[PDB]
């Protein structure tokens, strides 16, 4: 049963495994480099181990010290997105289970793919710089030497030296702060993470941060300008935590903090232990986008406790988490809401399968990331095809209450471990041994290794969705002499979620006659709405329907924020519309240098430039 991590160039967990990382680094905004030492406590899994390989990517190694002496090490040739392998020669051969501490002096590249450095003008305060990291999936090797594979979990401690005006925060418990001995204009922030965790969950942010308490164990952090809005926006957090605890068991991380990042954060939320990172585009003003927090919260169990062994099994992380996420939404807003959201998820699977091609390898639940940059393969598939499979199983095995019992057992069984799809499927059969006849009905191969839409579609309640479908159908089948019958009251009973589903249903049939679009703005005035999810969908609709007036609005949104979920589709649609083509390219080239590194790359690919 050998399964290697094709995305790593480091020695596998079967040879040696990292037990603890003690980091000591200094943040240098003048050189945009992170400098310091990483002392790795490594444990051998083999007899007579004489050397080990680590992953690195654009790092400048100064020296490697073991037992107080400098040792030999070599850096192989870069291998694109995988980076360069760093082979270290141990001074003394190790026997099984023996441990040694290897301290490495390094420095990050200003162009590290895991970090984004912001000048004062790119922040809200305008007076200070700001730095933040993003390691998922494999950018940790770009911050420090390590076994960059989720098959290895470790604990860590850290001391970060930063300018005294700023504050530092990490995916761990705060352990105090003191003045920097070797420099009076700096402070040293200390942190401790006692729960073993894969290295892609290590995070760091340094900026002019303020905090405000919103719950017994929850603090919300951000620049002074966003504090008030953030404390209200995420006020349902403690109730979400209680429900999740009841669903998966005790929360083992201690603290659950929320940090609101700069507009340029590439994703909606990142489940970093003790410190979830959220995009500021969630500040809708009405708490309507809080399901992004429920998602992050769910990972404190599925994802952070039980982890995927290699990235080929990414669906194990995201599929269960979305499934739990929707149960939290079910308990807070009703079962009909869970079905509404679940059905929207199926639509999101249809769209993604349409965009890749029904036979595209990326539409497979379990993909083979050999020679595939994980950033490139990322999509809605593992989320929605993963969710659909669990929902289908739920209905097949007797209902939500019985499947939630398997899920809690699943978490207990695999806590602090890293698993593969096969491990999951074996425990499922073991947990439901009294219903194997049923389990033997599902087409596992089609579900797990076949591309395109799932072989079978679950059953969804339509209640909350019918209203959206109905309004969408009236607009699509409407002729010119029907436009006058549309009025602002059509929307009086629709929530923000139903308004978003209406646009999604209409976007799936885009384009629409240009006159219809003008009529829609005339009566529903969608140009005024600020809900980023609805605004994004409205602007795509306009652009795809060729309305020149929306070009500037689409351009503005595509660049004032950088959540890839919006930015990538907006640039792609502007590039496909002959009227905005030239300008979309020019805008990309002008903002490129100051965009998140990963986002620049992907947008560069979509537009096919450089
Ligand atoms: Yb302490
Ligand atoms: Yb007519
Ligand atoms: Zn997730």
Curated annotation (Swiss-Prot):
- Spell out which residues are annotated as carrying N6-acetyllysine: 72, 336, 413, 572
| Result when mutating residue 375 to A | Strongly reduced hydrolysis of peptides starting with Arg. Small effect on hydrolysis of peptides starting with Ala. Abolishes epoxide hydrolase activity
| Site, as annotated: Pro-Gly-Pro binding | 271, 562
What about PTM? Phosphorylation at Ser-415 inhibits leukotriene-A4 hydrolase activity.
Which note does the record give on the cofactor? Binds 1 zinc ion per subunit.
* Subcellular compartments: Cytoplasm
Q: Which residues form the active site?
A: 296, 383
What is the recorded phenotype of mutating residue 134 to A/L? Srongly increased epoxide hydrolase activity
Tissues and organs where the protein is expressed, per its UniProt entry: Isoform 1 and isoform 2 are expressed in monocytes, lymphocytes, neutrophils, reticulocytes, platelets and fibroblasts.
Any idea which residues bear Phosphoserine here?
Answer: 415
The reported result of mutating residue 270 to L is:
No loss of activity
Q: Which residues bind Zn(2+)?
A: 295, 299, 318
Effect recorded for residue 375 to N: Abolishes aminopeptidase activity. Decreased epoxide hydrolase activity
Residues the record lists as binding a peptide:
134-136, 266-271, 563-565
Record's SUPFAM superfamilies? ARM repeat, Leukotriene A4 hydrolase N-terminal domain, Metalloproteases ('zincins'), catalytic domain
Regarding activators and inhibitors, the annotation says: Inhibited by bestatin. The epoxide hydrolase activity is restrained by suicide inactivation that involves binding of LTA4 to Tyr-378. 4-(4-benzylphenyl)thiazol-2-amine (ARM1) selectively inhibits the epoxide hydrolase activity.
Q: Which cofactor does it need?
A: Zn(2+)
User: Which positions does the site annotation Essential for epoxide hydrolase activity, but not for aminopeptidase activity cover?
Assistant: 375
Q: Which InterPro entries match?
A: Aminopeptidase_N-like_N, Aminopeptidase_N-like_N_sf, ARM-type_fold, LTA4H, LTA4H_cat, M1_LTA-4_hydro/amino_C_sf, M1_LTA4H, Peptidase_M1
Keyword line: Acetylation, Cytoplasm, Hydrolase, Leukotriene biosynthesis, Lipid metabolism, Metal-binding, Metalloprotease, Phosphoprotein, Protease, Zinc
Family classification: Belongs to the peptidase M1 family.
Could you tell me what this protein is called? Leukotriene A-4 hydrolase
Lineage of origin: Eukaryota, Metazoa, Chordata, Craniata, Vertebrata
